[PDB]
């Protein structure tokens, strides 16, 4: 159930609303395990 999980990651982690909209556009347009890991990787980094 990765898309729900990563949508919640974005909500929790990304406070800047433009970054949030871009990640959600990114997430909506990806579906493979490779693409999802790369989005997750950038969400994790963005909170450092
Ligand atoms: Br956007």
Curated annotation (Swiss-Prot):
What is its subcellular localisation? Virion
For the region Interaction with the nucleoprotein, give the residue spans.
1-48
Name positions with the PTM Phosphoserine.
Answer: 31
Q: List the disulfide bonds.
A: none
Sites of the modification Phosphothreonine?
32
What is said about its interaction partners and assembly? Homotetramer. Interacts (via multimerization domain) with polymerase L; this interaction forms the polymerase L-P complex. Interacts (via N-terminus) with N0 (via Ncore); this interaction allows P to chaperon N0 to avoid N polymerization before encapsidation. Interacts (via C-terminus) with N-RNA template; this interaction positions the polymerase on the template for both transcription and replication. Interacts with host RPS6KB1 kinase; this interaction may play a role in the viral replication and transcription.
Q: Which family does it belong to?
A: Belongs to the rubulavirus/avulavirus P protein family.
Q: What does this protein do?
A: Essential cofactor of the RNA polymerase L that plays a central role in the transcription and replication by forming the polymerase complex with RNA polymerase L and recruiting L to the genomic N-RNA template for RNA synthesis. Also plays a central role in the encapsidation of nascent RNA chains by forming the encapsidation complex with the nucleocapsid protein N (N-P complex). Acts as a chaperone for newly synthesized free N protein, so-called N0, allowing encapsidation of nascent RNA chains during replication.
Q: What is known of its domains?
A: The N-terminus consists of a long intrinsically disordered tail. The central part contains the coiled-coil multimerization domain (MD or OD). Forms a four-stranded coiled coil structure. The C-terminus constitutes the alpha-helical X domain (XD) that binds to the nucleocapsid (N-RNA complex) and the L polymerase.
User: What name appears for this protein in its UniProt entry?
Assistant: Phosphoprotein
Q: Which species expresses this protein natively?
A: Mumps virus genotype A (strain Jeryl-Lynn) (MuV)
């Amino acid at each position: 159930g990765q898309k729900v999980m990563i949508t919640k990651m974005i909500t929790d982690s990304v406070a800047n609303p433009q970054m949030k909209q871009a990640f959600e556009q990114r997430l909506a347009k990806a579906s493979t395990e490779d693409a999802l890991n790369d989005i997750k990787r950038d969400i994790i980094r963005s909170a450092i």
